[PDB]
Amino acid sequence: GSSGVRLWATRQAMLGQVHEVPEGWLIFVAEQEELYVRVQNGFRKVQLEARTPLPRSTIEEQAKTFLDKFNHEAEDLFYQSSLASWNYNTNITEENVQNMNNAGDKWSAFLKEQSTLAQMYPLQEIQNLTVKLQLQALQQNGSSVLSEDKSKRLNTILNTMSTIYSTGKVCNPDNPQECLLLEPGLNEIMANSLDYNERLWAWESWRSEVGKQLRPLYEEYVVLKNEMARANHYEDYGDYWRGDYEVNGVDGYDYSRGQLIEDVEHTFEEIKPLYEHLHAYVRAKLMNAYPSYISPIGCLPAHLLGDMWGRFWTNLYSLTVPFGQKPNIDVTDAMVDQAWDAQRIFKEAEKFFVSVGLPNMTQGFWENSMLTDPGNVQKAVCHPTAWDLGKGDFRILMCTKVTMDDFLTAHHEMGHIQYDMAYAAQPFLLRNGANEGFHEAVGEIMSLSAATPKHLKSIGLLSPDFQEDNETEINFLLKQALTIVGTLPFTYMLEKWRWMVFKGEIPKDQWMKKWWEMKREIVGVVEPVPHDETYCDPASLFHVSNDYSFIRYYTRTLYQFQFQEALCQAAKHEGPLHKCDISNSTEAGQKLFNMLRLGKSEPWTLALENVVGAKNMNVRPLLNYFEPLFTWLKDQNKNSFVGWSTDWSPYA
Amino acid sequence: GSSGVRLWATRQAMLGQVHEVPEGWLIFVAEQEELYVRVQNGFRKVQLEARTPLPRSTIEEQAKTFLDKFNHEAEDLFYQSSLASWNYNTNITEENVQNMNNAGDKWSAFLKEQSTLAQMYPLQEIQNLTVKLQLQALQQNGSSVLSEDKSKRLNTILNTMSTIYSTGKVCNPDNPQECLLLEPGLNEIMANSLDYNERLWAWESWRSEVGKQLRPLYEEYVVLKNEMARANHYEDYGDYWRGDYEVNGVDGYDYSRGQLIEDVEHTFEEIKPLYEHLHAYVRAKLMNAYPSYISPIGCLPAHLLGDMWGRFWTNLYSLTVPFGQKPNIDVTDAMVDQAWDAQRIFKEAEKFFVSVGLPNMTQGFWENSMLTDPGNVQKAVCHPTAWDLGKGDFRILMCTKVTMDDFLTAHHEMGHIQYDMAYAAQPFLLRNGANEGFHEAVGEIMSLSAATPKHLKSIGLLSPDFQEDNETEINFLLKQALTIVGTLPFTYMLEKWRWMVFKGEIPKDQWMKKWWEMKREIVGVVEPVPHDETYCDPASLFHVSNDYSFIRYYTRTLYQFQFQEALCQAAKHEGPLHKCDISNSTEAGQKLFNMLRLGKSEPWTLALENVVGAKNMNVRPLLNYFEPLFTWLKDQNKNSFVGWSTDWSPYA
Amino acid sequence: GSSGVRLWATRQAMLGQVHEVPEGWLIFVAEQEELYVRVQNGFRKVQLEARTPLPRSTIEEQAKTFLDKFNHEAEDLFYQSSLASWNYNTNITEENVQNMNNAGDKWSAFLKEQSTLAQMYPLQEIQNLTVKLQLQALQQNGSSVLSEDKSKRLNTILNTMSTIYSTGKVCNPDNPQECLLLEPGLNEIMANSLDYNERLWAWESWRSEVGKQLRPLYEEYVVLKNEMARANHYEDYGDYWRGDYEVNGVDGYDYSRGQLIEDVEHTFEEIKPLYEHLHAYVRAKLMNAYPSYISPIGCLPAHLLGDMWGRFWTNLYSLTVPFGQKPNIDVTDAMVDQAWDAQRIFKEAEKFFVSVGLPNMTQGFWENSMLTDPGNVQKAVCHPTAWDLGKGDFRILMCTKVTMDDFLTAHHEMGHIQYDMAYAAQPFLLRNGANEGFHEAVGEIMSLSAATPKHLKSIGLLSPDFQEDNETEINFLLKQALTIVGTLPFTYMLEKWRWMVFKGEIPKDQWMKKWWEMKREIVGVVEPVPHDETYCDPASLFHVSNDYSFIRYYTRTLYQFQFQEALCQAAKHEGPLHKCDISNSTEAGQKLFNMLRLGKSEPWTLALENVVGAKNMNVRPLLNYFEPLFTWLKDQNKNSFVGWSTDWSPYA
């Protein structure tokens, strides 16, 4: 049968009424706070533990209520800052500048108030993974952990380094009044002009007037960040940046900050045979252009890698082309013939996104964002940016033209937007990518998919009569290797160098003695002229001098290769990975959106495991993508020396 | 999520149907006497304690029937005994005396038989608190816990000192044939005559005469009082008295015997600053009367306190009046001018009770009680006493004359009788107050309200143009302090003295030395002639000789002040507490009657908490009542020593 | 007041909704499997034991199914086994001999297999007393708890002594070929011939041929009987037998094996004065018969008691009759006067058994059982046995003749089967007596009632004119004392002797000497010829050699006395207890049937309490039964010295 639970006022009433209480009927005493079970000819007291007072809101619940209230206020405040940011970037005016000051101060003050209001909430007793992740992402004091003077000094130094890099100007000895900046002056000169002396001077002059100036600033920046990290229970500032990839609280998915370093080391070792052959071929081709400036046995000059830091070897493609008479993959004729426009490019990207199974895109983007150049009466930023303004607002700000590149950037910005629309369901704190290499990877794979000849043929960009030969595939593989695989050692060595310089393993009087020697050995990049310790060459880059973790580029490339291979596997495509296309593949879009919606609500390991199939960052897709390149690279370097000599330098 | 509790005969159908049992459904098994909770994929055995036997034809019902039978027979027997007592009080004749002997013997024999017949009824298996308390009162064997000879000699000694106290006579040394009794000779001598010689001689001669013949008797009485208290599971006879205040088995209101001791001590310690100032002023007035008989730092003489044992300082109010030029408040002259008798005393008094919300009081009292001296045909005792005969019969014995003081006494007696009929619904055992300080407090609270000029003005006793300035307020407050507050230290020390005299910590050769040390240090009064252990001065009081608890008076004062303050708070009175009146406030009467009807069934702490809100003892209303007096005493004691010194004595 | 149980998926929802949970409503969460009770201002956690993995198949269910399956099949196998034994017992034939050989083999193998199956059903987790008790009987391995060789040799030694006792023959020295078996060649000559020499020679020869031969066999039998007793968790084989009387787990009726020894000793000690008077008078009559062979103070001869073991003094009733001239009570000649046979004896037995109120029994037993020897064509056994063949089949083996002795044994036999089918509702294992001293007691009590002169007169066995004087009552009482009370000391001591023989307290070189020492001090009987430890006189008993506990007879005597006293109390018998008759008393049969139906399921101590009113056994009925004889023995002991002497011997 079935029985209920009885309750009376006094124990005397319980005794007088327990006679008619059937067996199995629980008796609860409000006066005595006791529990009894009606047994045969009696009632047995049920043991009860210590009194537990009613919590109006547990400490976990108090954090939940605070986080919800903060997120609700953050959505409006961030949207106001985002729209003010949009207005400034559409038109740069004095009124536009001042509302950055107001929005920035208001957002920072609100963030500081909530972070202080969140710091008392303990993360140990909260078992809610989403709530704990929100609190730790909100409790990051950062520079505020130190004193006011120390925090202000660090911010002022950081602004100084950014200002020096941005306004770094070099004047030629022939005309001291004539001076040029790094961009677009030094970058274009060292990417197109083939003069060794001009490139060498610009490389040396910039690293002199920037390195010498930044050397005390970067050194004080390093120590201030290191001491801030110590105050934040971090071994160094590199450990602070690796904390984004750090995962805790999830069984089977925990990731430590040291695991990221060892995976980067392991992946670089895997790419080392492929990069060595790529470097050897690029080295060999430079003798074909300049036989009396570089030696095949030695390394390659930093300024002769197509840029100053050796970031991109794409500028060396004209100097390293295997078959210059073979035309590259370019469909610019289709643009002019059919009068293609930027709005049409985005419309085709949306249509392609519909084809791959992903849903449509909001019309508020079209009515609030510009694609072409917005006339000339106003100044607008033409840099490719995708905007997540919050509360459903998604925009893109760039002077998009009608070039294959722009068609890829449009796809890239759509890929950024798709991520922004995807984790939008997650709370404001969790309404972002799991790490800094996910949002860029989605845009990159979208650009890679949009650049495939099959996708162009499907939408008519590529002529149906176009043929696919070995030379075109080899040149495309080399071009991708220079652009992406070429920058992998650059990201690998720069982030590594920043790691032990923050760890304090590099003595001050030997800084450049390590970087320039390590550059020659691990990567085989050699400085054209010697630099003493007064130089600050590693900090001459934008990201390092602007408080940016450079491990994003290596992680995003590792993710983008894994995503592309996983999409190809889900799209049952037949053919080489470089020719693989995800067009008309609903499996690819659905699989991609499975991790896209997660954002940072789940650990990045779970997001990665969702598509490729594992939490590791193995470069197997990279080897498979460039296996025909690797065999061709081995064929080209079958007689050419492979590797690099640490001893050799251009000045020696 | 809703469920209940299931049951089954045995474990065979239990585990054959546990699969069909939904999760969260509690299960009781009669065969195994076990409890289980159906959890997700399992069941957890609920811990069960020993089975409590169900109520049956046990001692519970047998005692309840015995209690009902006892109450029925005690109602008639007590009615007959109280009828005989009133008749003897109305008419003192030889036939009335024989009635007392017969009624007293039968009542005592009946009580002891009920006590014996309830002795083998244990309370361990009885859970009814009302029955438990009633049967405990029945099981109050008393001195019969010892041998009969010990009880007989203790009663014989008690009657010896009580008779000696009544007949205690001192003779003038020059006139031996003329002797003055304590009642009313010595009392009147120290109440009216201010002569130091006469008061000292009467004080010394009485204590010597009483002490030299009662000291061995008091010692044996104390030893015997210790003997049957130890046999009654008490450390002394003090714990035997404190058992009435002790509360057990009631959650949130349990009281210990030592708790009242510490509460009384703490209340006196905070009272001490007010008492020291009052003692300072009375000492200052003693300098005004007899400059050479009181020291500025010394303690007051024992015989110069206005009464016999220094209890009440009302007789000193004439010599210690704050302003003797101000005439005292007295409506007796107006009352006699209005042709009002003792019948009008109770008639206007009954108007007061129906004014405060208390209902009409039965006409049986009016036809069964006298308000005047019944001439000289039948001798009547004029002592104030209220009688609850039973069966709805209620009487009050007092020679109520047409005076202001008898008006208060008439107010007190019917305050007793109104408490008597308040808990008439309670059984015979429960027909009593929770302690000995409640009935007197009830008769005191409304007496003070009646003595207030507002009540006299409302009933026409006082002229509407009566002036109430600060001088008459201070005089009234000081008179109240002398009559009530002045005796509070004496009540505390004497009860404390009698408490340790039962405990035996103070040796029999130090009873008088400790008594005078307490008198000097606590009371601030020093004897005019030193007394050795031959003197038995504490036993010279009526209460000590007749075995009467003295903590009842101090507790009653604390009770009456708390009761009055709550009544004033309930009546929404604004102004000084001494001017507070409860007339035309029906809420106060109804609220007061809520615990008056409760009787002694509930703990006295619960009753005190219900009245004001303080579960424990408090003296907060004392400060509110005498705040103008305390400020006046502090103002007037700036030029005089505050406190006392034990070193000084009138004899040294 | 009523309430229920509430559930929540997670504790977060529980905390939010705990405010809406009324007091008395239980809160359960499946995530933590935690139970809480809603209390005043909070929730109290309910203590829960370890979570079981839903064991829907308990051992209790499996054991109950196994027991029911076993009982159903065991009934058939035992039934056909009982048929074959009855066929052999009614017709001894070679084909019959192999019938029990096959039937016993199958039954034994079946029993050991079910015992083996019950071995994996431990009793700790079984809560049903009936299931636990039945499986305990099933799990009784007995001889198979040891190794096979120990069991095989124990059986072989058991067979050897059983054969030796059966074939125990002694030959006269003058006639080597003239030899007499113990039954009936030896027993007849000693019980009929009173010659001291012939009885002494037969006693000596029997103990020389059998005692010497069985001494090593008995010692080896005892050693092995101690071996599996400790393997069965018993300190000795005596404790193994005492385990049947042990009651465990029954609160208020638990019995221990040691308690049986203490109570048996206590009963014997208080019985001793009555036995000493009987032994003194029997000795006194022995000097009357043989003055030069028995001392007035010494113990009785072993061979001069009517039994070579000294069991029964019934053969001495003629030699020790209180009055040899008064005729004895016997109505056998009246049966042949009325032309009665064994059929009429049983028919009258049923009429008596239905006059006591118990229902008539079926006709199957009458047509399936013989009451007379089946001629001489087929050989049959005439020993008094009861056949509990099962399946509602009950039979009696008796060659009943038309005699009072056969009349009483016929009453004894039908009482046995009337006990058997009374508890037919019990399962096959529980279809047995509570102890070994109950089945014989049931047949004894009413057979004595049938033998009462009132019963004989009621149904016409004895003429109504028969006079009932004290002389016949004393003669009847003495015969009862010789047959029943006389065997009590021998029964108690021999079981006491065999108990410590298994225990090993008395060494092997003292057993028989301790027996004879106990025969003198306790039994009061002395051996006529001294022997050595080669003699094994206690092992000459049938029960010792055939592995039968001897405590059954002493317990049955006190059990039957208690049963008879309760029968007389229920029948409200007035006068001497030996003349009490239960005939024509329906209430007495109903009270007996209250435990007859109970069977062995309940503890025998509870059954004894239900009959009389005492949980423990007592000798009170013995005093009431033999009070006239006890006074007669006391009066006639003017020359009969109370007790005996250990020093005197027939040979010394």
Numbering used by the authors:
A (entry chain E), B (entry chain C), C (entry chain A): -37 to 614
From the study:
Therefore, we sought trimeric scaffolds to fuse three ACE2 moieties and leverage the inherent symmetry of the spike trimer to maximize avidity. Thus, we determined a trimeric antagonist fused to the N-terminus of ACE2 would require a short peptide linker and would be less likely to form inter-spike interactions. The collagen VIII trimerization domain is significantly larger than the collagen XVIII domain (44.7 kDa and 19.3 kDa, respectively), but more importantly, previous studies reported that collagen VIII melts at ~45 °C66, whereas the collagen XVIII domain melts at ~85 °C (vide infra). Given these observations, the smaller, more thermally stable collagen XVIII trimerization domain was advanced to develop the trimeric antagonist.
Notably, we did not observe discernible density for the collagen XVIII trimerization domains of the longer linker length constructs (T5A or T18A), whereas we did observe clear density connecting the trimerization domain and ACE2 in the zero-linker length, T0A. We then attempted to evaluate the ‘symmetry of interaction’ between our ACE2 constructs with spike protein (T0A-S, T3A-S, T5A-S, and T18A-S; where S is the SARS-CoV-2 spike HexaPro protein) by likening the C3 symmetry to an equilateral triangle with all sides being equal length and a corresponding standard deviation between these lengths of zero (s.d. = 0). Thus, we calculated lengths (distances) and corresponding standard deviations between the Cα atoms of equivalent residues in the RBDs of the spike protein (residue D428; as determined by Fan et al.) and in each of the ACE2 domains (residue N137; arbitrarily determined residue on ACE2) (red and black dashed lines, respectively).
